[PDB]
Structures are given as C-alpha cells and as structure tokens.
Amino acid sequence: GIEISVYYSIADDFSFNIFCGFPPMVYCDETYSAATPDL
Amino acid sequence: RIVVEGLNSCVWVQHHPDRPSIFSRPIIGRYIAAKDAYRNHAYAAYVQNMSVNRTIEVEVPFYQPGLYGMLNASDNNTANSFDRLRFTGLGDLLIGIEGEQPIPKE
C-alpha cells in the first residue's frame, strides 16, 4: 500500500484568541508504565 | 499544463496556429492524420524528458489574422466555415512521444 502522512502547523496570520480555562488532562506516563522501563 | 503519468520516455509538444480544428473534441492516436501525427518543422515547440519532470508548462500565443476570435463557436457551421476554421481556435496543440519505450498495460 501507500502511506500518507499529513503534518500541520499554525500559519503566520493565525491567532489563538480568547483564553478560557484549560480542560482536565491525562498524563502520558500513565499509558505505558515504567514498571517495564524497556518495552 | 500537460501532466503525463506512466511513461518513462520523452514527450514532444508542438503548436500549430495555422491549423486549428473545426470540431470541439480531441483526436487520439492512430486516428490522427499524418500531417499532424508527426513532428512538423519550424513550429514553436517544446521537448521534455519525463525523467527530469513529468509536468510540462507552455504558453500558447494568439496568431490569428483578424480582430477577434470567436467564443462559444458551433461545430455545425457551414455558412461561415472561414470564421469557424481560422477565427475561432488558437490552433491545435499536439502532444507526442519521442522514444522506443513501451507503454505499460495500464
């Protein structure tokens, strides 16, 4: 098959405009544990 | 802008301003008359190897003997054949192949 990878970023005319709260987050270190430091 | 995909050979392109078609449909391959099927001399042309780029970019000029060229012209035109023949189209553009490489089954 073919593989298509789309990367993206903000343009120069872009603006993140009105700051409301952050939503609650998850922690990446709680996906794959360090209980098996190499896996 | 001619985009040719699937061919590893070379493409030649000619512009025939004094030979424009009186039909609004293209002619393909073995149905093209000999007068056009082969490269003519002295015409403005461009020859491009697909190995360097598979996209050809050309600009076709206006070489007509009159004031205007007709837009939206009919293919059913016998009362004004002259208008339809030489005062309508910019002239045929021919796209051909220059090499011995075979064409893939696709």
Binding site: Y7, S9, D12, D13, F14, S15, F16, N17, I18, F19, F22, P23, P24, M25, V26, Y27, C28, D29, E30, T31, Y32, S33, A34, A35, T36, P37, D38, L39 | -
Partner: protein, 417 residues
Amino acid sequence: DNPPDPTPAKFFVPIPSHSWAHGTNTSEPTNTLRLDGGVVGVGRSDDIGTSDTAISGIIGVYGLLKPFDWNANDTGRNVGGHLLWSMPVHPQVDKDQVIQVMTQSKLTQYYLPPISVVSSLYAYTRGSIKYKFLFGNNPRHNARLLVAYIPGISSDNRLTLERARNSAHVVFSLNEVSEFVFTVPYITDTMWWPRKYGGPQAAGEFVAPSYICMFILNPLVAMESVPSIVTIVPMIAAGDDFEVAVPAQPAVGLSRNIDVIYPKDSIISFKSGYFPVYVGSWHSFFDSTKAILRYGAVSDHIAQLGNIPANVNRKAFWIVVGDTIKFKTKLDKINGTEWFIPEGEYTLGYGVVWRDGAYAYMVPYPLTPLGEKIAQYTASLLASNTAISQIRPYIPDYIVDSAASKDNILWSPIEDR
C-alpha cells in the same frame, strides 16, 4: 539576437522540504491555496483580538489545587507543630495534590492549573511560584500558620516545625483574613530545572528540587455559634520571574478521549481452571483476616497467576484492565500516617503479587487514589523482604466473600514514585 550564456552552473543540494522545527524568526516558502499570489493574511479588527498566547499572561492565572479541611475540634491534630499540608515545589503539581477523575480501564483525568499545563510542553523551568491560600472562615476564627520553603528536600520524612523555621518561611495570621499569597523562592544548584513528569515509560522524568510545608503555630479556634471546620483551598500561579526553556514531548494529552491500549506483552492473568475468582480469606495468610483472591471454597484453593515475565520490575504493583468485581473491605488507620480505608463496597482496581514458592497469588486493592498508594507501598515492602508481620497493617481486611468474576481477570504492570 541570441547571445550564449556560458556562466558556470552552481552546485546546489536538493532537499524535499523546508524546516520542520523552526517556528519563529524565519520565512517559510509554501504553496498558498489562494487566488492572490502575494503575501496574504486574513483580515482583522477590534472584534477579533490579537493572539493571547503570550506565556506570562497564561501561567499567571491561578489554578486550583486539592482542598482540605481544618477541624478546630480535632484535639489530636489541631495542635502546635502539626503538619497540615505539604508537597514538593515544582510547576507541574504533584498528581496527588490535584483534583482527579478516575475511570475503570481508562486513564485518569487531572485538573492541572495553567502553569502546570504550559510547563508540560517544555523541558526546563525556573522562577518563583505564587501559592495563594484561600480560607473558608469568618471573623470568629483565628490561628497562625507557618509555611516554609525547604530547598533540596523532596519529602517530609525529616520535617518538623522546629526545623522548618530554619529555612525561608512566612507566618500568616488568620485574624479576619481569608486570602494570602506565599510567593516562594527558587533555590537550586543550577539555572534551569528539569521537569518532573515527562513521557511514556517515564521518558525524561526527574524530581522536584524543593518542598513547601504548612505547620500549625497557633491552632485554629472557633466558637459554639460558628462552624468548627475551616476549609483551605490552595492555588498556584507563576511568579513574575518565571520562565520556560525547551519544547519537548508534552507530558499531557487531552481528555476528549481517555482510552488507552496497555501493552499485550505485559498483561498477566490466572492459570486456566484457576478462574473465575473472588475475594476471600485463608488460614495460612494472617489467620484468614486479610483479603486474597480465591478460585474456590475448599482451602488451599487460592487463585494462581500465570507466567510473570522477568522484565517486570520487582517493586511494581498491578492494575485491572478488563472486566472486574466489587468487594467489601476495610483498613484501620496506620500509625504515623493519615492512611485508612472506611468499611465499604469498592471496585477492584489494583493488585499486589504475593509469592509463595513456585506459586504466585494476587492481593486485591480498591480502585481509589489512596488504594493506589497503599498497593504501591506494599509492593515495595515485599521487594525489600520486609517482615511478614510488618506488611500486615498495609493489607485490606477480610469481611465477607464477594461476588465472583465473569471469567479471568487481566492485570497490567504499573509503578509510582
């Protein structure tokens, strides 16, 4: 005229794309999908502000931390020298000092403050931190607190009021005052400090450099016509001197999708014929007063775990992945800690492996933030070959046999600080 141009060709190096890393102080060639082929940018007005992504304006906004109660009638705790509240100082807050939401088989949601969210995007950090303390009091309540910043300390293992006074500290009076801010210093042996939480498998993680602790100087007083409990709500923001160094893998992800696929290679379960399982007791384990998983009511019928891979850390406890069960357990308060489990029905979320010869057994723990801590501590005690009699108070009690599982139960290895 058709003059030849014999100007020598230049050497050039072909590359497929422009910079992937650069985000400032450079132009970026690109094919704009517009009709206008010049330098074009969307129109604006006062209706549409400018980008509000200036970091200092973001991390200056206070975020809420885990609140706690301050009971004036507690003749045991409400005394001079008592430690009310304490934690390491770093921009990301400790996970156990932040409001949480747990989901069985999914990831935990943490309510991180703005300074914590932004910091998880960068590798280094430095500067003062503003700790605002909000008290639920009225003009009757009075007390005096001593809050201290202890450089080079990560825990309260050697921490007392009479030592805390020997570091940078402040003394707050609660006399008709409900809010005050303790802007703590930045005292380090280096200029930038590595973030604590990093990436998957603790990628690039480290520890906090200092500790903040709140001690009771003059105990809380109330009266009879007034609430005896005063809640304290800690909040956190960046000081004016706060900075963030270097873009790295975000320590965080959104909570729009809290699904996660644990590695299949680490999964363990019970041997065939040793499931379904239920929580119960047996005699050779603290005279059947503690909870373990059994596969039947005949004795020495304690569920055995399948092959446990050798790459699994010895100090690691386990978390249930698939379906689970509910069970009634309890745990009495442990000496020198605020660790206790009231008698109630809890879901099974964590487990610790108890080894007896060539047989491996599993000890159940409740799906609760405190259950996570007690499970981890127990696994550590088994790791150091601690006396069987001294691990006893860290194990949930046996009350009554619980429901059985539909089928086998799957577990995944985890480990905390």
